[PDB]
């Protein structure tokens, strides 16, 4: 015959890759543009309880 290491034989070495595939984060809409401390902002932030 002739040697065949074949598929799935415990001799068949497998190499694991170190690089990670990441399901990247959904891009946020309400970024620093909209949120503001002034009156002219879609999302106002109230600093009346941040230190009190």
């Amino acid at each position: 015959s002739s040697t065949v290491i074949a598929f799935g034989d415990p001799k068949a070495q497998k190499k694991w890759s170190s690089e990670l595939a990441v399901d990247i984060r959904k891009k946020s809409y309400f970024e620093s543009r909209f949120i503001g401390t002034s009156e002219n902002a879609v999302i106002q932030r109230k600093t009346e309880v941040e230190s009190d």
Binding site: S1, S2, T3, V4, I5
Partner: protein
């Protein structure tokens, strides 16, 4: 050149001595040679190392 070599054995002298004055010429033991032979043939085998996979 050959495929067979033969080698011989010379067995001992077994016989009867002629006691007295009995005439011995003509009663002569023959040397017995025994033969044997050995023959030569090839003996080969082969091993396989797989593929490139």
């Amino acid at each position: 050149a050959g495929d067979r070599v033969s080698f011989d054995l010379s067995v001992r002298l077994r016989g009867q001595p002629t006691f007295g004055d009995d005439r011995v010429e003509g009663k002569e033991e023959n040397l017995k040679f025994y033969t044997d032979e050995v023959i030569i043939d090839q003996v080969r085998h082969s091993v396989s190392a797989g593929g490139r996979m």
